[PDB]
């Protein structure tokens, strides 16, 4: 199917406690594959998935030098942001960055991304054309003018359409036994009496990859959107994810309820019901 590569940077000031911490992680789809942490005893871009370990020392040295460069740039950006927002040097602030590329089944670019946030709020984003910018406020408009003057979007576009897509294709091949394998959910329905009058039906999905999944409850074929409790999809720790959806049902009416599961790994969507 389709695939994505993403890098995430977080820069975190801490006045009085040293320089801002810089952490970067890289992902293909829902699989983390590299990390960098300026607070490590010896900071380096480090492998976090088995199929990246085969990259040679030139790769790791180049990535480490780039993250050290980025750490310095984002430490400076934190100082700049204080000036742009008239903020004091005593508070702790955060810059976040996400960028990368999406490709279709044939490996062609679908969409590129490059977005930044300040203190958890959107700051500036490269538009889908990979040539213009959307700035969130008058501070980000200064950055926008700076980046328009220096033709920063042209460099991002070249990266996103070129190296980003080419390295994603390489990683997908090197890690094809996992990155290109969907693990379908293992599913079952449980039943928990609440009172004489009601019971909970909980529809479980376990051990699936990738994380994207749809779990719904129907009653008499009608979606129970407002009355379903849906937990956030959560990592199991072994690559896979977990999710459940629950409804409170009148005693004896259990069989009017059906659970519907959709996942990339399933040839057809599943309909489940409680089976005492």
């Amino acid at each position: 199917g389709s695939h994505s590569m993403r890098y995430f940077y977080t820069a975190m000031s801490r006045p009085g406690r040293g320089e801002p911490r810089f952490i970067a992680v890289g992902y293909v789809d829902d699989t983390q594959f590299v990390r960098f942490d300026s607070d490590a005893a010896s900071p380096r871009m480090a492998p976090r998935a088995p199929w990246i370990e085969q990259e040679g020392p030139e790769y790791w040295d180049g990535e480490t030098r780039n993250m050290k460069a980025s750490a310095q740039t984002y430490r400076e950006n934190l100082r700049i942001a204080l000036r742009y927002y008239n903020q004091s040097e005593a508070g702790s602030h955060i810059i976040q960055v996400m960028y990368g590329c999406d490709v279709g089944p044939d490996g062609r670019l679908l969409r590129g991304h490059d977005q930044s946030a300040y203190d958890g709020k959107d700051y500036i984003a490269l538009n889908e054309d990979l040539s213009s910018w959307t700035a969130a406020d008058t501070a980000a408009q200064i950055t926008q003018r700076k980046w328009e003057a220096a033709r920063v979007a042209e460099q991002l576009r070249a990266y996103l359409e070129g190296l980003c897509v080419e390295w994603l294709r390489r990683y997908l091949e090197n890690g094809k036994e996992t990155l290109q394998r969907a693990d379908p959910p293992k599913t079952h329905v449980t039943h928990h009496p609440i009172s004489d009058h009601e019971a909970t039906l909980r529809c479980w999905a376990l051990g699936f990859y990738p994380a994207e999944i749809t779990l719904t409850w129907q009653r008499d074929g009608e979606d129970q959107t407002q009355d379903t409790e849906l937990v956030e999809t959560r990592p199991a720790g072994d690559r896979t994810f977990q999710k459940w959806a629950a409804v409170v049902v009148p005693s004896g009416e259990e069989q009017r309820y059906t659970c519907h599961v959709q996942h990339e790994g399933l040839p057809k969507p599943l309909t489940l019901r409680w089976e005492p």
Partner: peptide, 10 residues
Amino acid sequence: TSNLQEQIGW
């Protein structure tokens, strides 16, 4: 592979 830091900055 990460994008080369060009360090124009904000």
